[PDB]
Amino acid sequence: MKTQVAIIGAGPSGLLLGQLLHKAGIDNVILERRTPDYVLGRIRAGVLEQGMVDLLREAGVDRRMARDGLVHEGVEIAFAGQRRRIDLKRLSGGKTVTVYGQTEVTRDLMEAREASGATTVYQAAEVRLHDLQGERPYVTFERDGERLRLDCDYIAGCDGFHGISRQSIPAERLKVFERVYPFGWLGLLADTPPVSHELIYANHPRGFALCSQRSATRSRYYVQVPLTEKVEDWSDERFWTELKARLPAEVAEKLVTGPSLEKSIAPLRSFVVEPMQHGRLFLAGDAAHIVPPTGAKGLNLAASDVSTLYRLLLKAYREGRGELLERYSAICLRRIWKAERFSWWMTSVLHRFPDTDAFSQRIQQTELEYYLGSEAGLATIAENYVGLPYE
Amino acid sequence: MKTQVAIIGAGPSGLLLGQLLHKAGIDNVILERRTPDYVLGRIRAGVLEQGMVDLLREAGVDRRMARDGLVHEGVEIAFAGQRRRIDLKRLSGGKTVTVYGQTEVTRDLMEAREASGATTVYQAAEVRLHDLQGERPYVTFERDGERLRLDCDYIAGCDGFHGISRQSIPAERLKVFERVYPFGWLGLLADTPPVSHELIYANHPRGFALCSQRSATRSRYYVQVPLTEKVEDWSDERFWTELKARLPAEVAEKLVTGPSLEKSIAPLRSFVVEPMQHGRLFLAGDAAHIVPPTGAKGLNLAASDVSTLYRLLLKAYREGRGELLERYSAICLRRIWKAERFSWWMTSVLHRFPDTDAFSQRIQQTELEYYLGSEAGLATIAENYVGLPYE
Numbered sequence A, B: 001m002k003t004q005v006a007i008i009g010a011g012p013s014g015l016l017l018g019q020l021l022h023k024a025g026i027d028n029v030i031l032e033r034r035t036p037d038y039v040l041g042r043i044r045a046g047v048l049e050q051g052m053v054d055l056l057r058e059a060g061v062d063r064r065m066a067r068d069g070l071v072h073e074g075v076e077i078a079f080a081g082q083r084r085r086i087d088l089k090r091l092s093g094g095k096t097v098t099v100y101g102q103t104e105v106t107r108d109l110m111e112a113r114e115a116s117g118a119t120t121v122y123q124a125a126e127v128r129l130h131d132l133q134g135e136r137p138y139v140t141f142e143r144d145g146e147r148l149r150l151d152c153d154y155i156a157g158c159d160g161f162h163g164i165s166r167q168s169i170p171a172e173r174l175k176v177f178e179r180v181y182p183f184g185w186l187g188l189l190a191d192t193p194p195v196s197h198e199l200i201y202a203n204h205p206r207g208f209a210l211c212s213q214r215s216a217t218r219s220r221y222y223v224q225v226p227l228t229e230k231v232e233d234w235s236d237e238r239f240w241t242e243l244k245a246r247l248p249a250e251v252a253e254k255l256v257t258g259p260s261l262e263k264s265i266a267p268l269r270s271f272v273v274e275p276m277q278h279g280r281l282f283l284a285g286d287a288a289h290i291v292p293p294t295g296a297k298g299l300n301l302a303a304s305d306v307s308t309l310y311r312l313l314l315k316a317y318r319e320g321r322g323e324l325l326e327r328y329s330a331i332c333l334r335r336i337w338k339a340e341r342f343s344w345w346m347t348s349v350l351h352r353f354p355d356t357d358a359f360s361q362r363i364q365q366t367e368l369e370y371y372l373g374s375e376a377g378l379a380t381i382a383e384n385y386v387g388l389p390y391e
């Protein structure tokens, strides 16, 4: 079989790039290891930047978002008995963030592709990439026991952190930057009305807590746990008690608990690879980088890689300007690094680290005191949160 | 579930280490991505060193080998109309090589384990390794849709070149050495009596050719092909014509052709990672390194990693001397590098490289002339072929 752009992975990056490309007339096939069911089961992201909201409109998959998505004009940080709100709207010059689940964005894109008639192969086993540096690269996979070959011009690895793409580039060609945090995030999705109309990030001596939502009747809560924790050691009862314990009394007493729909632990890490391409292979999304969930930048950074990749591929096909693909990595990394720095900053100020000395604890407290108390301090959190401008 | 040593991969390395360990009283589980059928379908290796022959006896799986295996006392190299034999026996001090297929060695080990009652999980999907640097690491997998957890003390990645193990070690911790040759090997297995009682490696202007065997009525032939070749572009007819064309007339006219049982193309490469371990994770076999098939050192290097790993684990469990595991990589790499140098040497003297100048072509010819003409020259090929001593 022959396509123009072979896309590995059908999570938001692949689906979004597939839809952007198909709409512009560039044929593409998407190969996915799993079933549509498993992809749709991943809870993940809740906060979207206006950059992605616009790219979804541009890809024509925004009807449902514009109806169900909640537009948030502020966030709240809690520490040392105080609850400080950051007015994103005022401090960033009118930009905001939209809360709409990744499971939804992924569902909408899946349906759109399903209707478009563009090719998608779920349960595509043992994907191997070939002749990446050639003029004609190919992808091979197994469907029902028979090994097929797919020919294409370019390949886009949108296969997440554990994908085959990044592994297909010679090690000596990539330089890895990584940091693994000594903790994880225990999340819990409940069919209960959220404790606030805005998100409440919270620093507390027992550890970090986050009050988020999916809609007016669906919530998503998180608490920091050691990497040694097993999710089956955390009953619903225990999660509510622990969450309540880390939030301000006024917030803790308005909390409406309930059984969990989903409950899982996600480890925190920062990871960046340089460069993000190799021959006819361009990495996008988690395949190329991971950011701690603290700053809500993962899905949003994928959106920008995918926007930059699509626009360059348009020039390549539509205008024959294929030499611009060489700049993919350069453009992307400038944005990736700044979002990596924020996610790192946020993580370090909101979390309790093991074996922190008196001086560090104090500096962590003063950071929040300064930033949340200064107009210029607040403006730096706001512009970074709403999302730094796309290049 | 809880085991002592969790082994990822059930190719020869895993099976051999599982059997060596089980026999010494150390419990082990083997997780395999594929079906026993697929593993048994891989044709691969034909030549075994006396080191592995002995380790198989030590693991008690040699009845069939000692009956079906062919003990070879010499090999033959052909170039510039000459056919020079290397007497391995005389030149190495009495050592020899045994020809017995990998499919057989793998079959024998599979049956032995099957009888022993030791645990084996075929079709073990999405294996992820965890807490490698902890005191208690674990492996998670999916069997029939349900994700299980396996606890263990140590883990041995015997999952080949495309395994999850090597990918589980932080990139910044590993230094990769790699070389990809501009050609591959087109093999063809036929149920025909071999053209000679010994192997004939051959340098010819059209490219490399190798005359090998599995038994007196089963043969395995190879010819060098560009990486651009598709196996479906090579009919049986075409392979025989091409093989005949690269061999000495006297050898070419005694050839008994026939239809192919198996026919596939394998790309050539050299690959070494340093170090070969990380915390409670030790790499063995192809997971840690690849050698061009030219020198018949791949399976044999795996045998030595597995022998060194087992012996160190005996001291660790049996004698409580767990500090010796720190030397695993040091010991292994000394052997790996020398076998890598030979496989590289062999490859460079027997193959036709694209864009080779007059001087290089001549030096390639003189290398064969010198080595095959000098007593000291021949002795260097012989001692390396039969296998350099285990440390």
Ligand SMILES: Cc1cc2nc3c(=O)[nH]c(=O)nc-3n(C[C@H](O)[C@H](O)[C@H](O)COP(=O)(O)OP(=O)(O)OC[C@H]3O[C@@H](n4cnc5c(N)ncnc54)[C@H](O)[C@@H]3O)c2cc1C
Residues within 6 Å of the ligand: A008, A009, A010, A011, A012, A013, A014, A031, A032, A033, A034, A039, A044, A045, A046, A047, A048, A102, A124, A127, A158, A159, A160, A161, A162, A163, A164, A165, A185, A187, A266, A284, A285, A286, A287, A293, A296, A297, A298, A299, A300, A301, A302
């Ligand atoms: C708890 C949590 C909260 C988060 N919150 C936010 C938030 O509020 N806002 C935000 O911006 N970010 C957030 N993030 C990040 C975001 O979820 C990810 O960056 C995003 O899902 C990555 O998109 P992706 O499409 O690149 O990869 P993925 O989502 O990883 O999907 C990749 C696909 O590749 C497929 N695949 C893998 N290997 C293969 C193979 N070999 N063959 C074929 N296909 C293969 C997989 O099965 C998977 O379907 C959060 C993350 C977590 C864990």
Ligand SMILES: Cc1cc2nc3c(=O)[nH]c(=O)nc-3n(C[C@H](O)[C@H](O)[C@H](O)COP(=O)(O)OP(=O)(O)OC[C@H]3O[C@@H](n4cnc5c(N)ncnc54)[C@H](O)[C@@H]3O)c2cc1C
Residues within 6 Å of the ligand: B008, B009, B010, B011, B012, B013, B014, B031, B032, B033, B034, B039, B044, B045, B046, B047, B048, B102, B124, B127, B158, B159, B160, B161, B162, B163, B164, B165, B185, B187, B266, B284, B285, B286, B287, B293, B296, B297, B298, B299, B300, B301, B302
């Ligand atoms: C054409 C050819 C000829 C050769 N000839 C010779 C010869 O004559 N003599 C010699 O010494 N060498 C030779 N070699 C080399 C030899 O075949 C290999 O070195 C050897 O097979 C490697 O053994 P292994 O057990 O480490 O890995 P493998 O043989 O690669 O088996 C590894 C197993 O790991 C499993 N696996 C992979 N990933 C996972 C996952 N994620 N979960 C679970 N399991 C997983 C795989 O499905 C596979 O079953 C030859 C190679 C080739 C290609």
